[PDB]
């Protein structure tokens, strides 16, 4: 969470798990809850919540995020071998993979983590039964 970065607390992790367990990952109330708690989240924070969620609908949601990342990267291909950048915003950056928690809270990824929150909200909605 960004305020100065602080990691997602055990209290909120426990509350998220309780919400998912009692109502399901893609229940409208759970999606709404994710929407609210992720407002100040980095992409790394969002992944914390996704990752602690027990392993059918979870895989489907993850797959939908994967599909959004594929479509993004196809529309934003990086420069060829040997050619100078700048590199476009890539889906692994949007997803915060390989970013230190601190790095993920920095100004370089403000629009990126906002977009990622949207990808996840959409993935959750798309997998709602």
């Amino acid at each position: 969470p960004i305020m100065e970065y602080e990691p997602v607390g055990p209290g909120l992790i426990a509350a998220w798990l309780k919400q998912v367990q009692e109502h399901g990952l893609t229940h409208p109330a759970t999606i709404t809850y994710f929407g609210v708690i992720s407002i100040n989240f980095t992409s790394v924070d969002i992944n914390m919540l996704l990752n602690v969620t027990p392993g059918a609908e979870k895989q489907l949601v993850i797959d939908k995020i994967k599909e959004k990342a594929i479509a993004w990267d196809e529309m934003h291909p990086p420069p060829p071998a040997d050619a100078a950048g700048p590199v476009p915003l890539t889906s692994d950056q949007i997803r915060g993979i390989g970013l230190s928690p601190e790095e993920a809270a920095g100004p370089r990824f403000a629009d990126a983590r906002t977009l990622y929150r949207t990808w996840v909200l959409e993935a959750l909605q798309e997998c709602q039964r």
């Binding site: 196809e74 529309m75 934003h76 291909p77 420069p79 060829p80 040997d82 050619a83 100078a84 950048g85 700048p86 476009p88 915003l89 950056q93 100004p107 370089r108 990824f109 403000a110 629009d111 990126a112």
Partner: protein
């Protein structure tokens, strides 16, 4: 001292499109500004005149300045093949920002890009050193001749360039 202004006269398949001028932020990044200025006048015996924008990506940026290899693998500065990142004081705040292309830390040569959007993920990685003054509508026209991977549908060239005032 006053920040220098330089111009590119841009052509599309050899036909004059129009002029884009830039303020160079010599007050904040004098070394980087001077490199671009000198390459624009051709006073060192080499530079931007006749070169192309080899990589134009709509919604991202227009990249050029590779006057040796014309494909993103070349270019050189007035300080040698590469020079260091001068500083990262200025940020990629939106359309019109002029910034150094590079292939990693301290690899500045002659290649540059003109943002057509805010590109904040590049902050602290590419040295910002100027901004479009006149001719943003020309840059927008150039941008439309690009594609997702940068390949241009028309030859976009710097027909002439120099320093104003």
């Amino acid at each position: 001292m006053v920040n220098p202004t330089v111009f590119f006269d841009i052509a599309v398949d050899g036909e004059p499109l129009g002029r884009v001028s830039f303020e160079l932020f010599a007050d904040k990044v004098p070394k980087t500004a001077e490199n671009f200025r000198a390459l624009s006048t051709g006073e060192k015996g080499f530079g931007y005149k006749g070169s192309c924008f080899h990589r134009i990506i709509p919604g991202f940026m227009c990249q050029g300045g590779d006057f040796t290899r014309h494909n993103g693998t070349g270019g050189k500065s007035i300080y040698g093949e590469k020079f260091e990142d001068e500083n990262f004081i200025l940020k990629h705040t939106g359309p019109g920002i002029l910034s150094m292309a590079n292939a990693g830390p301290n690899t500045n040569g002659s290649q540059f890009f003109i943002c057509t959007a805010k590109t904040e993920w590049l902050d602290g990685k590419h040295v910002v050193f100027g901004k479009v003054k006149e001719g943003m509508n020309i840059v927008e026209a150039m941008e439309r001749f690009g594609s997702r991977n940068g390949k241009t549908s028309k030859k976009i060239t710097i027909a002439d360039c120099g320093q104003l005032e």
